[PDB]
């Protein structure tokens with residue numbers, strides 16, 4: 316399932332627990348950017364997905380403040396879990412930095428991450 | 435400032451509490467889409483923003499399953515809160531539906547929602 | 555309807571001609587960013603839209619090189635034209651800067667621009 | 675360089691010519707979606723890129739109307755060309771469908787395509 320440790324193509328680490336209620340909790344350690352150590356993540360997933368070979372929709376957020384650094388930014392990942400023996404979480408993400416109003420047009424980066432489950 | 439009841443340009447209702455250390459917890463009621471009533475949301479926000487006039491970064495997720503319906507999809511909103519006389523949350527969002535691998539290319543809608551505390 | 559001079563919420567000026575068979579050709583002058591004066595744009599639009607009240611899909615690209623400056627970046631706008639008494643072009647855009655491979659993760663900004671023919 | 679034939683992970687075909695003036699022209703054949711045969715594309719690229727090992731920024735548009743079908747939609751790809759012997763064009767894209775105003779919130783799909791040059 317979703318619960319476990321995952322790594323993406325950048326070398327970031329995603330440790331997550333999926334709760335019976337649809338909750339995602341855990342920590343994220345980013346390999347790049349204005350980040351060090353682990354950050355809290357929270358999110359949600361479809362706890363009763365279709366079983367017709369569709370992925371399980373999910374998303375989560377990290378605000379890039381922990382007890383060692385603050386980037387004044389937040390990323391959300393939106394995507395789907397694809398189960399089986401080579402499980403993947405395939406995502407697109409939005410990274411919004413706090414900006415002044417004049418600079419809001421350049422506040423948000425977009426990208427895509429693929430996570431592979433370890434073990 | 436983030437804590438409260440917010441409404442976007444579609445008429446959706448976003449009820450949220452900002453916990454002191456960065457949690458966002460609340461409910462979302464979508465006015466459009468395959469949705470009815472309230473859905474659980476969780477997210478995070480910068481609980482110590484910059485003091486230079488910059489907004490407060492945040493994000494949250496809704497999985498579109500509740501006791502009424504399950505759309506087999508999830509939306510994340512990423513944005514910033516802008517305080518002031520008319521506080522606003524300006525976001526972009528990603529709505530991913532569960533799909534087959536083959537159809538993953540058409541799994542994700544993108545858009546932008548603006549929230550204020552002004553009731554329609 | 556698409557042909558004309560448009561302005562977005564940032565004050566940028568988008569001057570475009572819609573050719574009969576789907577071409578968009580014009581210039582873009584950005585009011586923000588690493589840009590000055592006009593830049594060439596090209597794009598495409600649906601030259602036979604649906605007749606059910608739907609907007610007209612379109613998109614265009616600017617590479618941010620002209621005789622004045624080169625930002626080593628390019629923006630694409632994807633959206634729809636909505637005709638009517640106050641015609642509008644509603645878009646989302648992707649601004650990709652050239653980066654190293656390692657830094658590609660932070661290469662692309664996303665946003666949304668609304669255009670009308672109303673001069674600021 | 676950019677001029678040539680490219681294929682992406684979906685099996686789509688991108689035939690492009692890069693002009694000295696920064697123009698991109700060519701045709702696109704989509705392997706998926708509401709599409710058949712070739713469609714016109716136009717775009718732009720940075721004709722004087724940095725040479726410090728950065729990619730070359732570019733973008734292009736296809737409106738999904740040709741003389742055999744009309745999807746009432748348009749895709750833009752924004753990305754960068756990475757030269758060398760295994761040249762790539764790495765993109766993110768936005769596919770906007772014409773909708774009614776009430777349905778505009780669901781008008782736009784986002785994704786990512788990687789193109790590999792043939793030959």
Ligand SMILES: O=C(O)CCCC[C@@H]1SC[C@@H]2NC(=O)N[C@@H]21
Pocket residue numbers: 323325327345346347348349350379386387388389390408410426428659
């Ligand atoms: O630079 C910042 O504002 C904080 C760190 C951001 C890292 C981003 S989140 C999206 C992408 N995926 C990763 O694992 N790292 C980058």
Ligand SMILES: O=C(O)CCCC[C@@H]1SC[C@@H]2NC(=O)N[C@@H]21
Pocket residue numbers: 442444446463464465466467468469498505507508509527529545547779
């Ligand atoms: O149709 C679905 O899959 C679930 C409902 C989706 C509603 C979307 S979330 C983004 C946008 N903002 C809203 O308030 N509603 C729509």
Ligand SMILES: O=C(O)CCCC[C@@H]1SC[C@@H]2NC(=O)N[C@@H]21
Pocket residue numbers: 420562564566583584585586587588589618625627628629647649665667
């Ligand atoms: O800074 C750059 O790399 C070039 C100028 C970018 C301006 C961007 S394009 C998207 C948005 N809409 C505008 O009118 N201006 C900004």
Ligand SMILES: O=C(O)CCCC[C@@H]1SC[C@@H]2NC(=O)N[C@@H]21
Pocket residue numbers: 539682684686704705706707708709738745746747748749767769785787
């Ligand atoms: O379905 C449509 O509206 C027209 C065809 C869209 C195909 C899309 S464009 C983005 C992605 N990359 C491809 O090569 N095909 C899909």
